[PDB]
From a paper:
Thymidylate synthase (EC 2.1.1.45) catalyzes the dUMP methylation reaction, involving N5,10-methylenetetrahydrofolate (meTHF)-aided concerted transfer and reduction of the one-carbon group, its products being thymidylate and dihydrofolate (DHF). N4-hydroxy-2′-deoxycytidine 5′-monophosphate (N4-OH-dCMP) is a substrate analog, reported to inhibit the enzyme from bacterial, avian and mammalian sources, as well as from certain helminths. Inhibition was found to be competitive with respect to dUMP, and apparently mechanism-based, as it showed meTHF- and time-dependence; the dependence on time pointed to the slow-binding inhibition. Novel evidence is presented allowing further clarification of the mechanism of the slow-binding thymidylate synthase (TS) inhibition by N4-hydroxy-dCMP (N4-OH-dCMP).
Structural results provide further evidence that such incubation, also with the parasitic nematode T. spiralis enzyme, results in the inhibitor molecule being covalently bound at the active center via the pyrimidine C(6) and Cys189 sulfur, with the pyrimidine C(5) non-substituted by methyl, but acquiring an additional hydrogen atom. Within each of the two active sites a clear electron density was present, identified as the N4-OH-dCMP molecule. However, no electron density was found that could be unequivocally identified as a folate derivative molecule. Both N4-OH-dCMP molecules were refined with high occupancy (0.95 and 0.93 in subunits A and B, respectively), with each N4-OH-dCMP pyrimidine ring conformation pointing to sp3 hybridizations of the C(5) and C(6) atoms, and the distance between pyrimidine C(6) and Sγ of Cys189 suggesting a covalent bond to be present between N4-OH-dCMP and each of TspTS subunits. The C-termini of the subunits A and B are in the open and closed conformations, respectively (the last four residues in subunit B were not modeled due to poor and ambiguous electron density). The C-terminus of subunit A is stabilized by crystal contacts with several residues from the neighboring TS dimer.
Residue numbers in the entry:
A (entry chain A): 18 to 41, 45 to 307
B (entry chain B): 18 to 303
The structure:
């Protein structure tokens, strides 16, 4: 067996490492404009196998996004620390966000998805009923106008850029319905191919499965489009090791309950079948 | 001589026509469709991707883009330059069908130009004074290209869900990112909905021209235009005409020369652009 989708990812890593352009004083190798397709049919789920992906973090982060939260403490208290570095006192101060409490990411993903256009005050404020709920509107359009070419969720509001700890990387999403199947395309302005991309593929494939479930559709495809696709120079050796590994079949993902609505999912609803990755890679310095 | 980038476009037409999904659509005409495509067009050596297997309305590309840049949403300003491409979506009849009863004819609502130059400003009408209002994304992108060319955040969006009830037609070409490496400016545009027959050739030219303009004013060389599409479709009414086009071996693209030094994006004029050796096959109307 050969996992063509994962091999394609490894081939894109190889193209960046061997032929990418240096961009900086910390350095990357970079290319601009890539696209990959991941088949979600038969419940196959594109969780990469050549290096273990932090699946628990994928699930918890996505449920947190869906809830509309921008409070990284809520995620950290669930033992997922991936947003703690971008919401520390030191990082916030470095962005000039001196009045934000630690944990306040500003109006990032969850807020844009559920409350677009609402003025942001802080992560603890009530936003219920405020702003444009793009996530619910997309679900509505999938069900009411599946032919639509306008089923869009944006995370990009230039008016909010001064208020965010980090501008959203995964910033534009479109859904599509054909032949009883739901597909999703996500546009990512900036992608760390080594650490971010595998996690991000899983996040949006999971979102697609969740929405397909509550819209009574079968899963189609996840299409990942990238602007600046890059690898950090310090990671090149670890990625060279990873590229020598043989991808295994992807796992399957099952949803174990008839879930009521997009806000009703729980971590325990998701079963990953036969996920057998290689271990995470750590390369000691030698020079 | 053969043109590989145009051959790729023709191959995409063939795949949609032979294998696309039949969709009903907003217009009621019906389409063959695929979801998720990407193509790259090289802008090096002044080569300019104006398709050759049919004539593209170049004068309309230029005038429409200068109009976008100005921030205008008044289709009468284009129509008065004998560019009628937005007249159908801004007639009294169409505006009334969208519930836009108080718009004067010509008012497209807060579409491309308004979003590029005035994002977030409440829209009233096409004739209101928006000078200095909203977020000038176009000028901010140019500033970032000049001052922080390595940035991974050089973005212009045309999508504001809060404005969707005010527009005649929601923007099709709706997200743009710029990128600088090795002294070359590239641009990727995301198009949620692409009429492969009529729209796409025009849209490729529009964003390639914008990339050339911005490279020129920032003293960069042009790199690539990357076109990413959501719903790429062919209207059933277009299939026969597109079958004529797919039988043609594309010719090499023209070159585009910019004829004077221009320092600000708002300073370009139509006569600054010279299209060299554009040699299209006989026109195909749809
Ligand atoms: C941004 C965040 C993400 N998911 O939330 N995925 C990513 O891969 N990233 C990476 C891209 C880049 O290396 C860095 C963001 O820095 P810039 O804002 O300068 O692009 O994080
Ligand atoms: C929208 C406008 C454009 N340039 O201005 N390019 C395009 O190709 N279009 C096409 C896409 C589609 O056929 C139609 C818009 O209808 P929807 O809003 O229903 O997608 O125009």
């Amino acid at each position: 067996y050969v996992n063509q989708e994962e091999l394609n990812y490894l081939n894109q890593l190889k193209d960046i490492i061997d032929h990418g352009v240096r961009k900086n004083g910390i350095g990357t190798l970079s290319t601009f404009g890539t696209q990959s397709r991941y088949c979600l049919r038969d419940d196959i789920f594109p969780l990469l196998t050549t290096k273990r992906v932090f699946w628990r973090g994928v699930v918890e982060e996505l449920l947190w996004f869906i809830s509309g939260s921008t409070n990284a403490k809520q995620l950290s208290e669930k033992n997922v620390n991936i947003w703690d570095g971008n919401s520390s006192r030191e990082f916030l101060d470095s962005r000039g966000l001196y009045n934000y409490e630690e944990g306040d990411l500003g109006p990032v993903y969850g807020f844009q998805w559920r409350h677009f256009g609402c003025p942001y005050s802080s992560m603890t404020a009530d936003y219920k009923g405020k702003g444009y709920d793009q996530l619910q509107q997309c679900i509505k359009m999938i069900r009411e106008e599946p032919e639509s070419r306008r089923i869009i969720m944006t995370a990009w509001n230039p008016c909010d850029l001064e208020k965010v700890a980090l501008p959203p990387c995964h910033c534009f999403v479109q859904f599509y319905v054909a032949d009883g199947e739901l597909s999703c395309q996500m546009y990512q302005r900036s992608a760390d191919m080594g650490l971010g991309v595998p996690f991000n593929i899983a996040s949006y494939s999971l979102l697609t499965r969740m929405i397909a479930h509550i819209t009574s559709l079968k899963p189609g495809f996840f299409i990942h489009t990238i602007g600046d696709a890059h690898v950090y120079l310090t990671h090149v050796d670890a990625l060279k090791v990873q590229m020598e590994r043989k991808p295994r079949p992807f796992p399957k993902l099952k949803i174990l309950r008839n879930v009521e609505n997009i806000d009703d999912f729980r971590a325990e609803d998701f079963e990953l079948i036969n996920y057998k990755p290689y271990p995470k890679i750590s390369m000691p310095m030698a020079v």
